[PDB]
Design a protein around this ligand. Sequence first.
Ligand SMILES: Nc1nc2c(ncn2[C@@H]2O[C@H](COP(=O)(O)OP(=O)(O)O)[C@@H](O)[C@H]2O)c(=O)[nH]1
Ligand SMILES: [Mg+2]
Length: 160
Amino acid sequence: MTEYKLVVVGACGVGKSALTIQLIQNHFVDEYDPTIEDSYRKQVVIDGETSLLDILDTARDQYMRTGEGFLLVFAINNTKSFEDIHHYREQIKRVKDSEDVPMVLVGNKSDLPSRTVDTKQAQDLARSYGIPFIETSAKTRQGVDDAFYTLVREIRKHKE
Ligand SMILES: Nc1nc2c(ncn2[C@@H]2O[C@H](COP(=O)(O)OP(=O)(O)O)[C@@H](O)[C@H]2O)c(=O)[nH]1
Ligand SMILES: [Mg+2]
């Protein structure tokens, strides 16, 4: 019965869309229009509780204001995208007017061998933020459920 508005943010090309589509449609899209910004709905069950997810895949001022949780996505083979995380976080903090916003740090493209962002680096950032860090591959589906479900768990602990 509960609904959760989730927002997926991060630099262009990190796999925001691919991640969202795997969760929604259960397949990996190789070439999804980089400019398309849209929301996707799905009824899920998480730790036994039924819930409707409304997920904005950015590429809206509305979702920022009404978003209850955010995935901060970088790709592990894109140092610049990891360096952009702080900016995304501060922007959310500003709009939401809080310092306790539910967020999850997501390191995507974990199947790729060209790693330039150490796991240690990401974990150290997430620790400073007090948020979970989850490694994912939209391509193999590794960690996809875990990223979204973890965010939902962070939302629930926050409003409780
Ligand atoms: N190898 C690999 N490629 C990915 C992964 N996620 C996304 N991609 C590719 O990276 C490119 C951009 O992905 P996209 O989802 O559009 O990124 P977005 O701009 O953040 O929405 C596309 O070529 C995707 O196929 C992943 O986990 N592994
Ligand atoms: Mg996209």
